[PDB]
Amino acid sequence: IPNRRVLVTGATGLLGRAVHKEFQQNNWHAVGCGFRRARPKFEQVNLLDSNAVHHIIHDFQPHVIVHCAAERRPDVVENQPDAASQLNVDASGNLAKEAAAVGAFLIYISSDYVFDGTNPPYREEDIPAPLNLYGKTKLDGEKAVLENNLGAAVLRIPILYGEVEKLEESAVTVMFDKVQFSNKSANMDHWQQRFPTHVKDVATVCRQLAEKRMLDPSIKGTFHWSGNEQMTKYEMACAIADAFNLPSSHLRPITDSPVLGAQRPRNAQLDCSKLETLGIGQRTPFRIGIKESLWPFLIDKRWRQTVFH
Amino acid sequence: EGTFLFTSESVGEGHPDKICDQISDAVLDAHLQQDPDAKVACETVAKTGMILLAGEITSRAAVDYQKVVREAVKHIGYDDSSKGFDYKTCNVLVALEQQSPDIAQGVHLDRNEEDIGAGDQGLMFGYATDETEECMPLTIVLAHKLNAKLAELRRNGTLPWLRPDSKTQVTVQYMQDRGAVLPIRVHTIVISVQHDEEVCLDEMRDALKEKVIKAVVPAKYLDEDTIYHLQPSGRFVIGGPQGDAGLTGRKIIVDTYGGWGAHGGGAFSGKDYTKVDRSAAYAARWVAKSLVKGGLCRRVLVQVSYAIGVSHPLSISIFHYGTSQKSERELLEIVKKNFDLRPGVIVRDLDLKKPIYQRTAAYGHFGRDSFPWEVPKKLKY
Amino acid sequence: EGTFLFTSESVGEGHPDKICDQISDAVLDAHLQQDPDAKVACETVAKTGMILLAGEITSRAAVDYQKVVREAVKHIGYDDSSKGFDYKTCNVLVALEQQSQGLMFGYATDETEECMPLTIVLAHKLNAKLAELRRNGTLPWLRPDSKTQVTVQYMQDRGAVLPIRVHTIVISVQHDEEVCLDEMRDALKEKVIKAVVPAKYLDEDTIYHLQPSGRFVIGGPQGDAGLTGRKIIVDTYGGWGAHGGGAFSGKDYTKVDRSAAYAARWVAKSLVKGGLCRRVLVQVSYAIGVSHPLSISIFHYGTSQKSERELLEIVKKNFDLRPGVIVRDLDLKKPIYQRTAAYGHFGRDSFPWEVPKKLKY
Ligand SMILES: Nc1ncnc2c1ncn2[C@@H]1O[C@H](CO)[C@@H](O)[C@H]1O
Numbered sequence A: 001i002p003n004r005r006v007l008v009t010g011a012t013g014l015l016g017r018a019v020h021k022e023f024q025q026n027n028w029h030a031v032g033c034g035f036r037r038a039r040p041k042f043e044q045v046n047l048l049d050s051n052a053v054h055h056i057i058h059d060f061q062p063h064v065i066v067h068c069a070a071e072r073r074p075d076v077v078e079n080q081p082d083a084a085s086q087l088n089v090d091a092s093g094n095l096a097k098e099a100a101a102v103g104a105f106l107i108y109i110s111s112d113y114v115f116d117g118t119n120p121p122y123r124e125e126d127i128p129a130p131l132n133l134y135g136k137t138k139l140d141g142e143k144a145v146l147e148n149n150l151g152a153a154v155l156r157i158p159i160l161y162g163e164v165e166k167l168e169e170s171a172v173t174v175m176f177d178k179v180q181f182s183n184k185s186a187n188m189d190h191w192q193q194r195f196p197t198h199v200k201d202v203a204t205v206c207r208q209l210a211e212k213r214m215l216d217p218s219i220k221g222t223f224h225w226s227g228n229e230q231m232t233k234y235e236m237a238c239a240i241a242d243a244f245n246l247p248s249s250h251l252r253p254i255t256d257s258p259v260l261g262a263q264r265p266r267n268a269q270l271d272c273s274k275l276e277t278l279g280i281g282q283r284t285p286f287r288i289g290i291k292e293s294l295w296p297f298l299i300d301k302r303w304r305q306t307v308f309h
Numbered sequence B: 001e002g003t004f005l006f007t008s009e010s011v012g013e014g015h016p017d018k019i020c021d022q023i024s025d026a027v028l029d030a031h032l033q034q035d036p037d038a039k040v041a042c043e044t045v046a047k048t049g050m051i052l053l054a055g056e057i058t059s060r061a062a063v064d065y066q067k068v069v070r071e072a073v074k075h076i077g078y079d080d081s082s083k084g085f086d087y088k089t090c091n092v093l094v095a096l097e098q099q100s101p102d103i104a105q106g107v108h109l110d111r112n113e114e115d116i117g118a119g120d121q122g123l124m125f126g127y128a129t130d131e132t133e134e135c136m137p138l139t140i141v142l143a144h145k146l147n148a149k150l151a152e153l154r155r156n157g158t159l160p161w162l163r164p165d166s167k168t169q170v171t172v173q174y175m176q177d178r179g180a181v182l183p184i185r186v187h188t189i190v191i192s193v194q195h196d197e198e199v200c201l202d203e204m205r206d207a208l209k210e211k212v213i214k215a216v217v218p219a220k221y222l223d224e225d226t227i228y229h230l231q232p233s234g235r236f237v238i239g240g241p242q243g244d245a246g247l248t249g250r251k252i253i254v255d256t257y258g259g260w261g262a263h264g265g266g267a268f269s270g271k272d273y274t275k276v277d278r279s280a281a282y283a284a285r286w287v288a289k290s291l292v293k294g295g296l297c298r299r300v301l302v303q304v305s306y307a308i309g310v311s312h313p314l315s316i317s318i319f320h321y322g323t324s325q326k327s328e329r330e331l332l333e334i335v336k337k338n339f340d341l342r343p344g345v346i347v348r349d350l351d352l353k354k355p356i357y358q359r360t361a362a363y364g365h366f367g368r369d370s371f372p373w374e375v376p377k378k379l380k381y
Numbered sequence C: 001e002g003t004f005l006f007t008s009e010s011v012g013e014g015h016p017d018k019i020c021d022q023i024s025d026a027v028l029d030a031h032l033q034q035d036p037d038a039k040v041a042c043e044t045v046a047k048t049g050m051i052l053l054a055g056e057i058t059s060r061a062a063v064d065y066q067k068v069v070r071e072a073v074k075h076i077g078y079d080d081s082s083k084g085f086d087y088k089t090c091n092v093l094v095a096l097e098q099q100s101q102g103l104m105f106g107y108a109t110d111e112t113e114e115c116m117p118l119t120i121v122l123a124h125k126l127n128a129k130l131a132e133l134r135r136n137g138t139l140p141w142l143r144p145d146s147k148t149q150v151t152v153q154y155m156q157d158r159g160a161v162l163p164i165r166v167h168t169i170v171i172s173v174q175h176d177e178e179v180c181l182d183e184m185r186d187a188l189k190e191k192v193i194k195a196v197v198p199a200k201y202l203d204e205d206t207i208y209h210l211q212p213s214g215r216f217v218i219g220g221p222q223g224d225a226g227l228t229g230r231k232i233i234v235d236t237y238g239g240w241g242a243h244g245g246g247a248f249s250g251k252d253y254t255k256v257d258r259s260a261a262y263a264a265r266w267v268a269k270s271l272v273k274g275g276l277c278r279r280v281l282v283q284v285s286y287a288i289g290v291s292h293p294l295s296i297s298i299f300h301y302g303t304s305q306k307s308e309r310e311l312l313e314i315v316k317k318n319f320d321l322r323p324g325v326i327v328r329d330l331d332l333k334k335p336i337y338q339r340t341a342a343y344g345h346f347g348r349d350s351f352p353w354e355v356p357k358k359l360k361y
């Protein structure tokens, strides 16, 4: 059982599962937690509960703490704002309080939606200006984390995909049914520019970063990472089709801005020099990662996924 | 949200049906220490004060059926009137004919070992699942370890009011995951067990929960809502063969996968490799385990079938429960390219002439340490 | 293609493990006629010239075990010592001890008329057809011990399974030493297989393993010992479905292992015939302290457009699965169990649990 200890919040979720695992299988003692339904694999915690959080930090004494749990769906934020702010910003705070009060290295996972996408590619120290509320809540997190912990690291990250359990876990993986039903025609956004990023890559950067900070206390502040294949939500759908040897034709590419899309940033691309400099980072090809991530939701496989023959 | 309960039960060394599986297998071992090529279909029957052997053995061994049978019963632990059965004084009856000559000249006589035909027809299955290290389904696994623990502590001294006869049922609450299953929590546990007259329920129940269950079932699956039913309907010394009947080969779901996957009716115990009911059922398990471990599927169901006198099996079929990225045809084609499931070959791969079968006759034949069939094969493809 | 194989087996009345299954239910019938509340658990053991009976009974009925055991062994057709066994000469030992949770499955499938998997129904029916041709006379060289295996090629498809064709057929059946090896195999093809397996499934490509043992003159108890409850998968869904472990024959209706198995099957065969799903498995979890099931899980293999949510709801209206109710509906005190003890339990029109309840939902 390794010496270094790492806490991974939101480990029930897509991104946290990968970080927990990358850290663990590269010789760390790694503890995951989440309210959602942590048990039996993880520890159960309500991040809004001060003591629940305080307890498992002061009983675990972690040197690195990665913070993935948050309200991520941009729509749900504008539906329930009282809560989204409470979890993205406040929890982040309390976590950052308890983090530096245990001498621990907080890595707050953030988001490209803190930018407006009017002048890409965006660098670490460029001027944030979100267009939507999720955009702003991930940003207010960054404050609440830095104001309560000099030497915590913010790590901004684009749209995520990866080895999901339910297609809704990623805005990439959802389109899948729309790609397999070659009979039904389906529209796809061709306006907004994206950079899909595999969470197992993100988890790699997350560990890579943390370890250097175990030697070098200058590792801190804000960082960008991102996969560098640039695609629309439509272009994704056709690489997914092609990756699985499927027709992408029933896919109509709509090129107009969505009717909510003056409040969704066009190309909020990240410049990953800051990290690339320190030689951090993994970039699994989309064409591969997405095929690794989706074959369990192939219909023919999906049919045979019962409990008994 | 698509989540289910499942239950597997297990019985312990001195449950009548499992004394017969044990004794029968003990008679198999007797013959194999002397004549490794023994033909054995020993079936045991156990009622009040009786052990009857019935069947067909053909072997150059010379075997003291009285000694063998009673040493098995002794080992199991019945040794006084008070306990309900006694090795020193039980009746032992031996009705053991030779192997039908028609079967021998249809199966193995005049044939090279490798080219031996199936010892009879039928279907076998092989199951495997990623839900546990041991690669078995958690229900049956826990079920067995509870009965194993009871013995350990009866035998090692640390709870010497115990007796051989026991029955554990483990209910688990599950979740589906892209074809695989996920043990979430233990819903219910039950432990009937035989004891002597000088203990109170409240002291046994306390012991069962803290010395056995708590030290077998990982804390992570237990919670404050997990039901325990320790000594369910009270006192229990009417146990073992007393007021009973017991037959070899009646606890086959328990011997195998606890009700998961599938079974083709094959009683294992009291049989040698030539009887595919057993050898191919191990081969099947080896196959499927080697595919889960190998890393191709996450859980898989295998089926072989043979016909009497025919080495190359008549059917082979894989069901990977939607869990592999490869097709089922692709896995089948691997299995053919890596295994060879004639009995004359399997005997060699899984070393099935060794007198160690009696181990198997309790606590399940699968998911267990040191068995040949449980050591996955590295696969070329 | 996206196809697969699936083998099931079945055994004739004379097969010694099944001999015992029958004699055990025979004893249960003898008691029920005199005492419907009689509580019975009877193991039967068969070997070269010996029928042994074992285990506890509680009843009012007094029963001539000599008579039961012999009239059954005659009906099966073991009549001369030329055959290995004879109802007239065999020993009958009796060792009965007489005074005065649960998890079961039911499975049904639309792949055949009887709502059983093709494989096992052809296995069953091949043996039944031998019993016929031995009893009528038309094949006089047959004897009562038999075993069929029927491997079918299948086509997975939107949940349910379509029998394409009959891949491999095994029949081994005990014969006399007058008839040559040929006349048999030839007759097995034309008199038996031809009569059972629908013309549409057979072809040049089909495989026949007929008397693959060469000789099969020694059989019945003489060839292999026989014990009650050693064909549980033959008795039910021959490779398909799922099984708890409950052997049936010899037990009476107070053991839910038997009773609920019929209830759970009834419930299934209702649903397939009633259109609510093409294929189905009914898991019925009984609890200690609860006379009702604690849980019912309904895997319909995606062959339904109604949710599993829904189907569970249709069951709790239409059925009543506490033991005390099932004994009533299926009438399980009627001494009729010896007719279940061969040729499968689930899949014949005769039985209470095989007439699909009209589902008002
Ligand atoms: N010589 C034989 N050839 C083929 N099958 C047999 C033979 N003898 C017995 N059997 C059948 O197979 C079983 C034992 O292998 C018996 O119960 C019987 O039904």
Ligand SMILES: [Mg+2]
Pocket: B249, B265, B266, B267, B277, C230
């Ligand atoms: Mg058997």
